[PDB]
Design a binder for this molecule. Structure first.
Ligand code: HEM
Length: 399
């Protein structure tokens, strides 16, 4: 059994293993860091099955849950939020914060998302490129999703800049285990004081909604409000940052695609759909443990055995997406949906928000900076380490 996670074939490419497994052994065993053996499913068909089956569990306390790292094994001991719950506890807690993320709620947030993007672009323009390109990640990719989520949670405007750097420190590569931990409790501590304020003086934000609708009536404890809020902050922020930078690099890599977008910003949604398919920036989140014997393909996964469903592999499934390894915003989509945001009940709560932010960024960026270009040779782009999810650390640009 090969050790998993697999290493990306290269900077922007998924692991070379998926393609061969998909063709020769769709459902197979891999070995985790601690010697454990888990099942790895690679076909779109099987990934959807794993993501919806009632015979599979997301509870991390269950022996056999596929933890990918030592640190991950230690994080499993904390009190769970809906992300690690099975029905009916899952939807019961998830429905408490879901209203802000529905398609219509997100449609009403468009004017705000647009202004945030416009303001950040202007700030970046107000420092030019005086014999010095700017890092698109620090100046734009990072602030955009951070300010938005922080603002929705309830953080006052003047605190956004500092809190944005703190959250970034948690997931930063050059961060010690000490500074990452200090950043965590810093964010948690701030969220606690915020919940106290919103209990006294509630307002229009996710925390006030929790306090007024769930905390006060005794539905959940204050610590729970802190947990869910913290979950909403850390769950997909690092991912959004990478998706934005990955989108810019991809347009740099296919000038023909960029030309079409510049000529018609209306193509943004299609570009985003292909981007979330082609670059599956969150590839290790669909994991389960079998509650009972279940047959997947020709294999039979026994009770208490772990399963990892690769949505990244599923998104390159030749059986579903014709010419999967080709990035094409003009591609004709099949009836089966891409799995960039997961599938089933645990499908990303912020999928519509994530897409709205990306569409806003990509329908505005090149209208503001028509001549925007990566300042370093494409082969020199600083991608995240090959054994981690796909992303970009920094991205030098001139405009
Ligand atoms: C483009 C960026 C994003 C990508 C590609 C992404 C991807 C995913 C994926 C693959 C899952 C796993 C779902 C499953 O188990 O099937 C997920 C879950 C989740 N995401 Fe995102 N996500 C993104 C942004 C966000 C943002 C911005 C937030 C926060 C507002 C967020 C919050 C969550 C939460 C809380 C869950 C767990 C939902 C549940 O278990 O019911 N995600 N996301």
């Amino acid at each position: 059994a090969p050790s998993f996670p697999f290493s990306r074939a290269s900077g922007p490419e998924p692991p070379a293993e998926f393609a061969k497994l998909r063709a020769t052994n769709p459902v197979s065993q891999v070995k985790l860091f601690d010697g454990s053996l888990a099942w790895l499913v690679t076909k779109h068909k099987d990934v959807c099955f794993v993501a919806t089956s009632e015979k599979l569990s997301k509870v991390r306390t269950r022996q056999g849950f596929p933890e990918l790292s030592a640190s991950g094994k230690q994080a499993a001991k904390a009190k769970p939020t809906f992300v690690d719950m099975d029905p009916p506890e899952h939807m019961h807690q998830r429905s408490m914060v879901e209203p802000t993320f529905t398609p219509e709620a997100v449609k009403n947030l468009q004017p705000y998302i647009q202004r945030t993007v416009d303001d950040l672009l202007e700030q970046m323009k107000q420092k030019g490129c005086a014999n010095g390109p700017v890092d698109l990640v620090k100046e734009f990719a990072l602030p955009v999703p951070s300010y938005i989520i922080y603002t929705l949670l309830g953080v006052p405007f003047n605190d956004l800049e500092y809190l944005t750097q703190q959250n970034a420190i948690r997931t930063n590569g050059s961060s010690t285990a000490r500074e990452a931990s200090a950043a965590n409790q810093e964010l948690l501590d701030y969220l606690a004081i915020l919940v106290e304020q919103r209990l006294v003086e509630p307002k229009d934000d996710i925390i006030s909604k929790l306090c007024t609708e769930q905390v006060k009536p005794g539905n959940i404890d204050k610590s729970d409000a802190v947990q869910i809020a913290f979950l909403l902050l850390v769950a997909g922020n690092a991912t959004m940052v990478n998706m934005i930078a990955l989108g810019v690099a991809t347009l740099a890599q296919h000038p023909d695609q960029l030309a079409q977008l510049k000529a018609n910003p209306s193509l943004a949604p299609q570009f985003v759909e292909e981007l979330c398919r082609y670059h599956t920036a969150s590839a290790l989140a669909i994991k389960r443990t079998a509650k009972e014997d279940v047959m997947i393909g020709d294999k039979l996964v026994r009770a208490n055995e772990g399963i990892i469903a690769s949505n990244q592999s599923a998104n390159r499934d030749e059986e579903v997406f014709e010419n999967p390894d080709e990035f094409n915003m003009n591609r004709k989509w099949p009836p089966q949906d891409p799995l960039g945001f997961g599938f089933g009940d645990h499908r990303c709560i912020a999928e519509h928000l994530a897409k709205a932010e990306l569409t806003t960024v990509f329908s505005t960026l090149y209208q503001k900076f028509p001549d925007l270009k990566v300042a370093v040779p494409l082969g020199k782009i600083n991608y995240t380490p090959l054994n981690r999810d796909v992303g970009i650390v920094d991205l030098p640009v001139i405009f």
